[PDB]
Amino acid sequence: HHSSGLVPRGSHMMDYIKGMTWGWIGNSEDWRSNEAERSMEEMTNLAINWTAIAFQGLQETAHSPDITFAEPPMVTDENVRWAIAKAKSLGLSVILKPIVNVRDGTWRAHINFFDKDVPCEPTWSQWFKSYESFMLHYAKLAEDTGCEMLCIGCEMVQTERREKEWRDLIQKVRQVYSGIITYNCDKYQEDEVTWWDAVDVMSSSGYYPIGSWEHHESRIKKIVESWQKPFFFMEAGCPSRLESGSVPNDWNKNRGQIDMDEQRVFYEEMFKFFHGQKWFYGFMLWDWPAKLYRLEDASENDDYCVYGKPAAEVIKSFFTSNKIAKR
Amino acid sequence: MDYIKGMTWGWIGNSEDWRSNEAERSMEEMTNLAINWTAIAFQGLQETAHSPDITFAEPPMVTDENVRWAIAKAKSLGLSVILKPIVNVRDGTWRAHINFFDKDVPCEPTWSQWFKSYESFMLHYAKLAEDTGCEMLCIGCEMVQTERREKEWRDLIQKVRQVYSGIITYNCDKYQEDEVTWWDAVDVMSSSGYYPIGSWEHHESRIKKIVESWQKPFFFMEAGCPSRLESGSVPNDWNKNRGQIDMDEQRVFYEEMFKFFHGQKWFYGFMLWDWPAKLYRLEDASENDDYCVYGKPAAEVIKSFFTSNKIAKR
């Protein structure tokens, strides 16, 4: 079967993740471009050994049950096979990360249905069936392509209390995908998921503000030791924007207000407190686009991407450092 | 507790409509339903279902003078009043989805922020209800994804009791009568009785058992059906089959509802939904797709019920 502690059972193979997310938001036209190959090749100069191939599925509202995927403008299955194979050809292990977004712009963490099944109303059973179709489609692609890990959800905060349905989904994923399973909880939520034992590896979105990282190392260490599972950050990063380090999760904050040093300071602090601890298994950073801006435009770019910015050198020196390279 | 023979007036609560000459004519016409109560209903607004800030009494919403007018006009017509302030969401999301994380997270909106804003909204109107002598205050409507916040609901009710001495209800949604754990904190239980054609005998049995488990008075704070094709299958769905007129669908809904819910000693009647501040012309009624019964067959079902042997006695 599957239940295990600090190491996933051998049949599913823990590696220290030195990663960068690639491809968000998952647009077929961007992934099919020439430019996509150049972008992924450049990403390898971060001295990463993993990438999360990340792309969206879509539902209309936070309270609608039906998820669409693999229809324009979203990635085709061939686009996904290409990205996985390209990453493996560059020496990377792959986390496949299908993420549901909401067409009306609502953050997916608010996706939610009534606790009670009411006749005229959308139900959890309807949404889980649609979510299962989406995730099992990509679990089968992950198996076919040899992805080392599958992330079965991201920041789905207002679904996490649905423990029986998450465990049922996981059992269905295990029947079609034989690699490592993680679930990416949101910032601050590491001790709030009741079903961590059903996945192989715990992970979170480590969007902790400047000045908090020492506190969160102590907090997360205790949580991870209580669960006896490997843990890593499935997202971590900061836009190169004025004050972004106070709310590094806020992708809409202070657009166009450039601050290279804010991003650099965020990364220096994060690596100062989360490095080689034996209970900790590293970083899947956020993020790197399929269409990468020119190097000459980097100093005026406001994105999470570190290409051409001082934070990139903090990342490379951390990932190539012996203390990390020995893990 | 009175037996409520009621119609809701004033929704959605637009100052310009309520200050019109037409508003007085509308409310006077409503009295010909042989009602003895009205719910004066109007909106407050928040931006999204996960926004903490509620705005009220700012254009285009009702002024406090407009609310004092509607309550006094209703009382001058011999009606007891339920004051019903209802939060809506500017993006169109149904208020039943208003919700926040169970965990307080630093960068995120919190239940404490939303309940502080909701308290300011509801206490403003609770004080207006006290000042104007409203017989009842409805402290929320169909707030399904806030009902589990039991301590915060009880805390809000304790504040409301300090400023309002009349009857308090909370209006739960359809099918939710057994799901609210804090019914004891209000005086009267109530729900949105949007039960489909063919289900009323079942729901009478279901609701009787719930009400007898609590040993409190119960009535419907909303009940009604648009005069539209197949609206009786989903009488809550205010957006269903717009412009597809069916006067008989609405009549059949009302006949069934009154067949099963009438004079039971545990049951305290109906606040029907709804009647606008600006009422269409009688000659336009047969082509009107609203919940309003004015000029339609269902109005005669309602009048004959509210004046009937079994009901006039309660």
Side-chain angles (χ1 to χ4, degrees):
Chain A
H1 228 202
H2 315 295
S3 56
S4 60
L6 305 189
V7 191
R9 293 192 190 197
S11 66
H12 293 309
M13 314 274 327
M14 172 67 189
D15 253 41
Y16 186 96
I17 308 305
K18 307 181 299 182
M20 178 60 73
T21 305
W22 187 94
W24 188 249
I25 202 169
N27 176 98
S28 177
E29 173 172 6
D30 286 3
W31 291 29
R32 83 177 155 243
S33 67
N34 287 158
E35 291 172 46
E37 186 173 41
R38 304 201 239 91
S39 164
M40 199 185 286
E41 288 171 354
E42 191 62 60
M43 186 182 67
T44 68
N45 292 133
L46 296 176
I48 53 162
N49 61 352
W50 283 79
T51 185
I53 298 298
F55 53 92
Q56 72 173 351
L58 281 167
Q59 63 186 70
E60 285 296 323
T61 75
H63 318 292
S64 62
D66 298 303
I67 297 165
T68 294
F69 60 90
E71 296 174 19
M74 291 174 275
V75 294
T76 73
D77 295 347
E78 175 182 60
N79 294 154
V80 174
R81 287 184 180 268
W82 175 79
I84 294 162
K86 183 72 196 180
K88 294 174 163 287
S89 80
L90 292 169
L92 307 175
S93 295
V94 177
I95 314 182
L96 197 64
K97 192 182 189 176
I99 303 179
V100 62
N101 287 334
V102 186
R103 189 165 319 256
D104 74 11
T106 304
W107 177 35
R108 73 190 76 93
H110 293 299
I111 291 166
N112 205 352
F113 303 85
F114 291 178
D115 292 332
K116 183 174 181 57
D117 290 354
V118 173
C120 24
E121 295 294 333
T123 64
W124 279 110
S125 178
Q126 292 162 349
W127 181 86
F128 266 97
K129 177 172 187 176
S130 194
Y131 189 80
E132 278 186 349
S133 291
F134 166 67
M135 189 54 57
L136 289 171
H137 176 82
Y138 289 109
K140 177 46 154 58
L141 204 45
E143 187 75 355
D144 288 352
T145 61
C147 290
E148 290 78 359
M149 191 185 304
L150 178 68
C151 183
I152 64 172
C154 175
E155 299 171 4
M156 300 296 288
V157 177
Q158 293 285 49
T159 78
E160 290 164 0
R161 70 186 186 284
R162 304 301 296 189
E163 172 172 352
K164 178 166 169 29
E165 282 159 303
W166 274 106
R167 289 180 183 281
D168 290 345
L169 175 153
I170 292 166
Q171 186 275 160
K172 292 181 185 94
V173 169
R174 292 292 193 186
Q175 296 185 121
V176 304
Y177 175 73
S178 68
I180 302 164
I181 296 164
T182 194
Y183 173 71
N184 173 180
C185 74
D186 201 27
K187 59 185 184 290
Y188 303 89
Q189 303 280 358
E190 295 87 352
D191 208 22
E192 307 315 309
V193 177
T194 58
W195 45 264
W196 283 129
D197 59 287
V199 302
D200 297 313
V201 182
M202 295 170 65
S203 72
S204 70
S205 286
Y207 293 114
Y208 295 113
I210 289 171
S212 74
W213 281 94
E214 183 175 24
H215 162 76
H216 287 300
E217 189 274 351
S218 179
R219 178 179 67 79
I220 292 168
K221 178 175 178 171
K222 288 175 198 167
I223 296 164
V224 170
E225 287 193 338
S226 77
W227 280 97
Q228 294 290 292
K229 291 290 219 186
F231 172 85
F232 73 108
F233 292 118
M234 262 298 300
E235 305 189 8
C238 184
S240 51
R241 304 174 193 164
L242 179 66
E243 317 269 48
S244 266
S246 65
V247 291
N249 59 293
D250 189 356
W251 61 271
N252 268 115
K253 173 160 205 208
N254 292 349
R255 295 181 171 285
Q257 301 184 241
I258 307 308
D259 195 333
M260 300 288 129
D261 202 60
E262 182 76 1
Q263 182 185 67
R264 186 191 70 91
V265 166
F266 167 90
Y267 274 95
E268 287 175 329
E269 186 180 342
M270 181 175 64
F271 296 143
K272 178 175 180 179
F273 294 103
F274 279 91
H275 43 81
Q277 297 92 313
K278 68 171 76 161
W279 51 265
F280 178 61
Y281 293 78
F283 301 92
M284 179 50 69
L285 300 179
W286 190 271
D287 79 318
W288 192 286
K291 284 194 166 319
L292 184 64
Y293 49 87
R294 299 192 202 211
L295 180 68
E296 65 199 300
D297 295 334
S299 66
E300 288 312 323
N301 171 277
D302 74 357
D303 284 306
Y304 279 101
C305 190
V306 297
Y307 173 61
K309 306 181 188 170
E313 307 305 322
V314 173
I315 293 156
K316 289 164 198 174
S317 55
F318 178 76
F319 287 163
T320 60
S321 73
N322 199 254
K323 126 187 130 279
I324 296 305
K326 68 161 35 77
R327 282 298 308 277
Chain B
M1 169 72 189
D2 270 20
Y3 189 97
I4 308 305
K5 301 179 297 186
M7 178 59 73
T8 304
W9 186 95
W11 190 245
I12 202 168
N14 176 100
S15 180
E16 180 174 357
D17 287 3
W18 288 35
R19 77 190 173 231
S20 74
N21 291 344
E22 282 107 298
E24 189 179 40
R25 306 209 230 87
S26 166
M27 198 184 286
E28 286 172 355
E29 191 62 64
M30 189 181 64
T31 66
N32 291 131
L33 297 177
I35 53 163
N36 59 353
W37 285 75
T38 183
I40 298 303
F42 53 92
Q43 72 175 349
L45 279 167
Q46 62 185 70
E47 285 294 325
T48 76
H50 322 291
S51 294
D53 297 300
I54 296 162
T55 298
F56 62 88
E58 293 180 24
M61 291 175 274
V62 294
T63 73
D64 291 352
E65 173 182 67
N66 295 155
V67 176
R68 288 185 177 266
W69 174 81
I71 294 164
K73 185 68 194 187
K75 290 174 166 289
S76 82
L77 292 168
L79 306 174
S80 293
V81 175
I82 313 182
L83 197 64
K84 195 181 188 176
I86 307 180
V87 64
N88 286 335
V89 185
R90 282 206 208 252
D91 75 16
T93 305
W94 179 33
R95 72 191 78 89
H97 291 301
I98 292 168
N99 204 352
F100 302 89
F101 290 0
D102 290 324
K103 184 177 178 61
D104 290 348
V105 174
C107 26
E108 295 295 330
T110 62
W111 278 111
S112 175
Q113 294 164 351
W114 181 86
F115 263 97
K116 181 179 176 172
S117 198
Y118 189 77
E119 277 185 350
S120 290
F121 170 61
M122 192 53 57
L123 290 170
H124 174 87
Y125 291 109
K127 289 163 221 210
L128 206 48
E130 189 70 357
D131 289 347
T132 62
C134 290
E135 288 78 3
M136 193 184 304
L137 177 70
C138 183
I139 66 171
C141 177
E142 300 174 1
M143 302 296 286
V144 177
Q145 293 288 43
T146 76
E147 291 162 5
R148 71 186 187 282
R149 303 301 295 188
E150 174 162 359
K151 184 170 166 46
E152 282 164 304
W153 273 109
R154 286 182 183 278
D155 290 344
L156 172 153
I157 294 165
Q158 177 180 169
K159 293 180 181 86
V160 167
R161 293 290 196 190
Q162 297 166 9
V163 300
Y164 177 70
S165 59
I167 302 166
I168 298 171
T169 193
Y170 172 72
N171 173 179
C172 75
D173 197 31
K174 56 187 187 292
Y175 302 88
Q176 301 281 358
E177 296 88 351
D178 205 33
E179 312 309 310
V180 176
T181 54
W182 47 264
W183 280 130
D184 56 296
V186 300
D187 296 313
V188 181
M189 300 172 56
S190 72
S191 70
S192 286
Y194 294 114
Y195 296 117
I197 289 172
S199 76
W200 279 93
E201 177 172 32
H202 164 78
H203 288 299
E204 190 275 353
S205 178
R206 177 181 69 79
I207 290 168
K208 178 176 180 176
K209 291 177 173 81
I210 298 163
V211 172
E212 284 183 355
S213 78
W214 277 103
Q215 297 289 311
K216 294 182 75 68
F218 171 90
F219 74 108
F220 291 120
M221 261 301 299
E222 302 188 16
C225 182
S227 54
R228 298 172 198 165
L229 178 70
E230 285 165 35
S231 267
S233 71
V234 194
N236 55 296
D237 186 357
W238 65 271
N239 264 317
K240 177 158 212 225
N241 291 351
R242 288 288 211 163
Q244 303 180 238
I245 310 308
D246 195 337
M247 300 289 125
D248 204 55
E249 186 73 0
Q250 183 185 65
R251 180 189 73 82
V252 168
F253 167 88
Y254 275 98
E255 291 181 317
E256 185 181 342
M257 179 174 67
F258 294 147
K259 177 174 187 182
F260 292 107
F261 278 91
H262 41 80
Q264 298 96 310
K265 64 185 187 132
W266 50 268
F267 176 64
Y268 293 80
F270 300 89
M271 179 50 68
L272 303 177
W273 191 270
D274 80 319
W275 193 284
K278 293 191 131 183
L279 186 61
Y280 47 86
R281 299 174 176 138
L282 180 60
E283 75 200 6
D284 290 332
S286 68
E287 285 313 316
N288 174 279
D289 74 353
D290 285 306
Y291 281 101
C292 191
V293 297
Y294 178 59
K296 306 179 186 172
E300 309 302 323
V301 175
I302 292 158
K303 288 165 197 175
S304 56
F305 177 78
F306 287 163
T307 59
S308 70
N309 180 273
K310 76 217 94 92
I311 300 310
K313 274 180 335 199
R314 280 295 310 271

